[PDB]
Amino acid sequence: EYVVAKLDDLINWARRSSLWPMTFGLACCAVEMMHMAAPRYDMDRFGVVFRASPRQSDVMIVAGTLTNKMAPALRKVYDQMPEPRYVVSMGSCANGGGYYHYSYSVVRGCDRIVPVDIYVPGCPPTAEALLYGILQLQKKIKREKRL
Amino acid sequence: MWFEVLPGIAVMGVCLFIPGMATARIHRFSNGGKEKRVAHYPYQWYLMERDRRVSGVNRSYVSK
Amino acid sequence: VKQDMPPVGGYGPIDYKRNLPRRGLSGYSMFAVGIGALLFGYW
Amino acid sequence: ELLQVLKRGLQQVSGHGGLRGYLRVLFRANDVRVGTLVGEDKYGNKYYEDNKQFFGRHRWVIYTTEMNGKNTFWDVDGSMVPPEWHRWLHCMTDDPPTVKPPTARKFIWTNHKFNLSGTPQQYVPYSTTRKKIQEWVP
Amino acid sequence: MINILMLIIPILLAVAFLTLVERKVLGYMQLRKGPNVVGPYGLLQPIADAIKLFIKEPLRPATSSASMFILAPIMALGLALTMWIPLPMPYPLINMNLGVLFMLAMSSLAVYSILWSGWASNSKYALIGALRAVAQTISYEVTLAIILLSVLLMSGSFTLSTLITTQEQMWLILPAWPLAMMWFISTLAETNRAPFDLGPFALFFMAEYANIIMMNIFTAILFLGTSHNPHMPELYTINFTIKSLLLTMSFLWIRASYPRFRYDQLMHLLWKNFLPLTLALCMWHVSLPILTSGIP
Amino acid sequence: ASATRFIQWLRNWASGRDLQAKLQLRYQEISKRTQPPPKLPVGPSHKLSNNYYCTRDGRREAMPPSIVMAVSPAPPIKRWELSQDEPY
Amino acid sequence: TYKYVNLREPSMDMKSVTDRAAQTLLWTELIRGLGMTLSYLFREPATINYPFEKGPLSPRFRGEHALRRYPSGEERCIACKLCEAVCPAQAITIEAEPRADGSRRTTRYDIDMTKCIYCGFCQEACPVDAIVEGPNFEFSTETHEELLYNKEKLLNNGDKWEAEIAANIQADYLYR
Amino acid sequence: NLMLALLTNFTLATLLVIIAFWLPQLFSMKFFLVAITFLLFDLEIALLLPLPWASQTANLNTMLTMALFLIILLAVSLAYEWTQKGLE
Amino acid sequence: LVSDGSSRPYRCKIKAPGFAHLAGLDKMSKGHMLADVVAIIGTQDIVFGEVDR
Numbered sequence A: 001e002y003v004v005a006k007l008d009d010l011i012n013w014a015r016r017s018s019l020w021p022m023t024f025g026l027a028c029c030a031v032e033m034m035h036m037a038a039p040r041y042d043m044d045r046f047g048v049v050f051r052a053s054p055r056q057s058d059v060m061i062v063a064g065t066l067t068n069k070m071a072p073a074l075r076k077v078y079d080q081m082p083e084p085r086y087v088v089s090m091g092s093c094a095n096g097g098g099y100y101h102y103s104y105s106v107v108r109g110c111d112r113i114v115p116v117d118i119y120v121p122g123c124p125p126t127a128e129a130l131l132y133g134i135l136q137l138q139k140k141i142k143r144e145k146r147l
Numbered sequence B: 001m002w003f004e005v006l007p008g009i010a011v012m013g014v015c016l017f018i019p020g021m022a023t024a025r026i027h028r029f030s031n032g033g034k035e036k037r038v039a040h041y042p043y044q045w046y047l048m049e050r051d052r053r054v055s056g057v058n059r060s061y062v063s064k
Numbered sequence C: 001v002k003q004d005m006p007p008v009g010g011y012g013p014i015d016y017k018r019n020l021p022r023r024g025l026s027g028y029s030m031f032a033v034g035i036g037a038l039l040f041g042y043w
Numbered sequence D: 001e002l003l004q005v006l007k008r009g010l011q012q013v014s015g016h017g018g019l020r021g022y023l024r025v026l027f028r029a030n031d032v033r034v035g036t037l038v039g040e041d042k043y044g045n046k047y048y049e050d051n052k053q054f055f056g057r058h059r060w061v062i063y064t065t066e067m068n069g070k071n072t073f074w075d076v077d078g079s080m081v082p083p084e085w086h087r088w089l090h091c092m093t094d095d096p097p098t099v100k101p102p103t104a105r106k107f108i109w110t111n112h113k114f115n116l117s118g119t120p121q122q123y124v125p126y127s128t129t130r131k132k133i134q135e136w137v138p
Numbered sequence E: 001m002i003n004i005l006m007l008i009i010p011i012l013l014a015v016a017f018l019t020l021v022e023r024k025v026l027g028y029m030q031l032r033k034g035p036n037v038v039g040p041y042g043l044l045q046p047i048a049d050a051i052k053l054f055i056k057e058p059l060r061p062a063t064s065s066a067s068m069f070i071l072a073p074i075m076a077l078g079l080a081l082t083m084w085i086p087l088p089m090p091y092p093l094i095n096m097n098l099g100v101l102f103m104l105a106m107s108s109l110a111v112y113s114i115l116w117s118g119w120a121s122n123s124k125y126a127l128i129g130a131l132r133a134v135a136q137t138i139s140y141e142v143t144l145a146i147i148l149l150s151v152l153l154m155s156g157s158f159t160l161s162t163l164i165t166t167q168e169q170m171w172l173i174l175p176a177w178p179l180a181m182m183w184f185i186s187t188l189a190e191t192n193r194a195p196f197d198l199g200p201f202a203l204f205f206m207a208e209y210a211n212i213i214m215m216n217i218f219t220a221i222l223f224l225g226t227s228h229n230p231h232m233p234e235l236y237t238i239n240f241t242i243k244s245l246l247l248t249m250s251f252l253w254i255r256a257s258y259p260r261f262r263y264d265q266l267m268h269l270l271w272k273n274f275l276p277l278t279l280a281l282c283m284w285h286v287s288l289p290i291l292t293s294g295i296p
Numbered sequence F: 001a002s003a004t005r006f007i008q009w010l011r012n013w014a015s016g017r018d019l020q021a022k023l024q025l026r027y028q029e030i031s032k033r034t035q036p037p038p039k040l041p042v043g044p045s046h047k048l049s050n051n052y053y054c055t056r057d058g059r060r061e062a063m064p065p066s067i068v069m070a071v072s073p074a075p076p077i078k079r080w081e082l083s084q085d086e087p088y
Numbered sequence G: 001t002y003k004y005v006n007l008r009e010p011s012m013d014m015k016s017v018t019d020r021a022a023q024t025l026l027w028t029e030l031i032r033g034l035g036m037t038l039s040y041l042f043r044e045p046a047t048i049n050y051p052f053e054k055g056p057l058s059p060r061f062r063g064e065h066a067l068r069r070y071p072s073g074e075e076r077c078i079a080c081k082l083c084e085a086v087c088p089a090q091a092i093t094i095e096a097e098p099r100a101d102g103s104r105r106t107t108r109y110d111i112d113m114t115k116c117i118y119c120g121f122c123q124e125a126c127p128v129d130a131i132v133e134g135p136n137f138e139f140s141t142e143t144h145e146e147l148l149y150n151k152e153k154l155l156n157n158g159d160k161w162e163a164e165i166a167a168n169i170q171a172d173y174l175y176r
Numbered sequence H: 001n002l003m004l005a006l007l008t009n010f011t012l013a014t015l016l017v018i019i020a021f022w023l024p025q026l027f028s029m030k031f032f033l034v035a036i037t038f039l040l041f042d043l044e045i046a047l048l049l050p051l052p053w054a055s056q057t058a059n060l061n062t063m064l065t066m067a068l069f070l071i072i073l074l075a076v077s078l079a080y081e082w083t084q085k086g087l088e
Numbered sequence I: 001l002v003s004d005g006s007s008r009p010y011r012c013k014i015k016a017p018g019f020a021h022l023a024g025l026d027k028m029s030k031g032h033m034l035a036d037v038v039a040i041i042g043t044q045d046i047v048f049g050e051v052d053r
Ligand SMILES: NC(=O)c1ccc[n+]([C@@H]2O[C@H](COP(=O)([O-])OP(=O)(O)OC[C@H]3O[C@@H](n4cnc5c(N)ncnc54)[C@H](OP(=O)(O)O)[C@@H]3O)[C@@H](O)[C@H]2O)c1
Pocket: none
């Protein structure tokens, strides 16, 4: 009914308000990830905190290059994450390998290991474009959890 | 500016302000004089014991 | 034409330190305040 | 000094609407601030900027309620701002519909589309391959 | 008896609204801004975190050792709320025969909350990391016991109601001048993150943030008070809320400004630096009511 | 209070002199749209006559001579004296 | 020119020793550390509200790939494959064909965003100035198929950004 | 009642645990010396507990000689601790 | 850079400070705590991008 449909909006709004990330470094992207903390392009203005908390965290942001050595390392982390989880591929390396696509040691863009929900395209993903890793994600939460 | 920070303090100026007021205003309903006595030592308890013996049999705090 | 004009006046810190003593240095003065606060406290 | 700052806040609430005006701005936008308006935009976007305020002050580009058919009142992102972002919002100095207009080409679209997402009318790839033909007929 | 329910639900709201003030004050200390997208000034986020963390967020069990993992939050949340009972807010909820003895004991019993959570995980790396965090909490309770026993030795018995009467015109900050600096550091003991950092994650720190307010009010009675005024309980409570929250900002100040001490050097702060200072003051506070007459 | 007059006294009092040079510091002398269209200058080329690549060799002398199969590699690196602006 | 770091024990006797001993008995440097953070709180936060305020940018900025065209219609790109060879990621794929009417133009033109490190060589190696990098960020997708740009079909949709492109290129000729 | 105050806190604490679980649907011997020192100091604090409690009535010349004496041996124990304590 | 007559450089190597600083950690960590190691990496500034060659 109408009461159930409005209640499902409140559950969706709980995630739309606050998202606590486990941001993976291991990239040149990691500096642009740290530019979220930088006051000019504020992200703590949202319900997002740089406390990380690896076991507690909801939305793991995979920034940049994933090598074959780090390929089983990121997968075991994703399994330890709670069930409402999203993956943001940050940078061209995390998408499909910007550079190093034809290299032997680099996995061809995250999806072969861990499923990606929102793609952030830019090498140096500008803090302008990176705020589509939060706001567009928040926009995409409709879910339509009926039953 | 402080039109954002101080509302975060003003909301604490209500919720943390409750336990101080709730413990004080409750003595209006429990007593006809807004006071509850604590024994600490057996002498003040005996005074409370004879106060229940005089006039009001059930009530602890009563005049005369 | 693209050119650069030098606006030099206050260049910045050329091995310069702004670390200056503030609100009165201790030595013997703040101890006199410290023990003085105790003596005024006990009395 | 404190009375002058309090009077500036009361005048700011009186400027943008009032009791219903400032409350609508506080809920939809992050912060409410008064300034000079540019006005002119396809699908009624406010874009009230020009104020000195602080660093990078091309302030308050308020999004239009239902630009194409999204009903953006409670939720709105940077999907708006039709070809004016380079001047009134980011890089240039002059206002796009006031001082320096973009030159007509008769090829660019008159109505600007929203962000491509999980909704219908989304991006899809294709190939220009004509393919090597096979001949078999009775 | 509605007063107990008037000291749990609005108290848990103060813990909930702490997360905003911790994000906004530290925010303005870091030139960034606090929450704004959520509500009018981000005031709708403490309830938003409550719906997020409790309802849909599940728990993947590492081992789940039958009795534990579910017992540790009872020792966390339960013991943190019992501390609110003997507090001398105008007229306290069932005033204890000895106030501070109940205050020191239930805080020392709160050490189990981090102990049982160390037993909750099967992994050895978790428990060794847990015992290291217990070692910080266990050590600073010695100083917590000493400073209390030297403050009370100046004036008043163990009753918390007598601590208001001694501060009729003069605060206890000035006679206990080195102890005022000492007690402020020793309060950073129950995993305060400012000195050093180690069921679900949500309700576990809801007890830890509650202990921060608990020590903030405990400082506001032992060192602050100004007056009592039995005629108007309103004038005390308005004045108390300002005094308590000014100390609450200072715990958000030390966490913002200062890095971790190195665990070993934090243990070198005690025994080598703090304990020779506090015991010398404890010796000094024995002699003071004997040197000059003042044994209430 | 949000009034600048009283606040500027507080920030100047609490460790070091401030007032000038703000945290934001993008109020005045920030030129938008850069400048009117400029003309980029040409180098020692572009102007005709005596502009041969025979004179401007670039990549010509590159061939490595094979050598042989008390002498120092250079005069020894002498230490430099302490800075006149700051001794320590 | 040789600076030094160490002061080599400044304390000597009485006055220079006790004040250095003061910041260990009591704190003072903690109060001095508090002072810098106190002044930092009172000064206004330099924050930009993203959907309403925007961060400063350049006239020449690289981020979004879109191919320009002439004022009187007609596709500006020639299919030289020049931009393919310069491309360090080898992202841009190109198949060339005659358009049956004399002119030599494009058929397949895929610039995948799975690759491309947004270097802007293809912007600067194009002799006809076809690929001009549009100052855009609004292209975050759900799938790979939605992300990698197809044979001109999504790139000639960059005509919607060509009003900015024609204005921003006015800094390119006679460089900045 | 004190039991009425205690049980209401504990029952609502366990009630939150019910919400937390039911509602969702889908080595080193050096640290031992710390515990030893702690427990041994507790009892000296326990003996120094009645200080603002027994001094009200009892003789001061007899107490002061004994009251300081407990804190002296509490520091003498630490004086033995200083000579080779540990790296932690 | 090792170069031929062709436009392609056949093997170049940049030996970034990563290999230099991480070699020292065998000596830097001797007789130091776990938290001391955290201080070593930062002051040497071992950026993990340096380890490519
Ligand atoms: N090992 C065995 O259990 C076993 C033994 C013998 C035969 N089989 C056969 O092999 C198959 C194995 O499948 P399973 O039992 O593993 O599936 P399952 O786990 O029960 O999952 C069924 C999924 O299919 C969707 N679905 C099913 N019926 C639907 C309907 N009428 N309309 C819309 N969506 C529907 C459901 O999605 P929604 O929730 O969104 O509707 C659900 O997620 C069975 O069909 C069974 O006949 C299995």
